[PDB]
Design a protein around this ligand. Sequence first.
Ligand SMILES: COC(=O)c1ccn(Cc2c(Cl)cccc2Cl)n1
Length: 266
Amino acid sequence: SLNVIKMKSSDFLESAEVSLAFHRTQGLMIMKTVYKGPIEHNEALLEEAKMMNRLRHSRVVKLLGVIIEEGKYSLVMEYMEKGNLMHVLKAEMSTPLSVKGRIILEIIEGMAYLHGKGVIHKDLKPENILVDNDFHIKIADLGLASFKMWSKLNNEEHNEGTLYYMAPEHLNDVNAKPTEKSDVYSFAVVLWAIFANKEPYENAIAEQQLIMAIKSGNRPDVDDITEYCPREIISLMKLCWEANPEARPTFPGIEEKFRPFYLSQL
Ligand SMILES: COC(=O)c1ccn(Cc2c(Cl)cccc2Cl)n1
């Protein structure tokens, strides 16, 4: 029903390198230029952008517009001042448990909305969770995982990746189709990183050792969390990173249990 704002490069002053760009009348926006080079896709690209523009939720980043010009293709989206979740977590100012709990609930809210719309994120990770100045979050798709046409354009010939959060069924198996349960596993490791204030598996020596470990049941070190972590969140963590994908809960199921716990205890 709603339409995509078709933007031009002229209404942007300059973009400083994913890049921050100032719109002459609308201010700061994040611009992801996808293609630069030598037209048949301009239709499937804008139709995909119209399909993605429908997703509107307070915890999902808004696609503000698209730039479709000759040999120039970009996506324009909201600007979040504080960066991604890992950048905020590694800052020296400690984030209280009330804010961390609020962030978790908002991640659950945004994930349940995307799944309810049939969208599987496939790349949920702290780099894809952007934070504003009020410590509110919004889920992004900076890798263009769900943008099928725009990712095809990104990987085209004439156009001039962590594993910590991938479900084990996708490690060493590119032919496995990601499901909603794959996003639930990613959420589990994001939960751990929120309380550990860092990335997991710091003591890993080699990528092949890490892959074999996770596939055999190895998980982020819970004892490595020095911060206080509620018993219920550790239980939610271990439930969401179960080896069997059918044992992992759904985000509406996570939402039903976590919201009363957050309101009453956090
Ligand atoms: C393209 O740049 C982005 O990061 C971006 C723009 C809009 N969204 C939200 C979104 C998500 Cl999170 C997952 C799947 C589809 C959509 Cl539309 N992400």
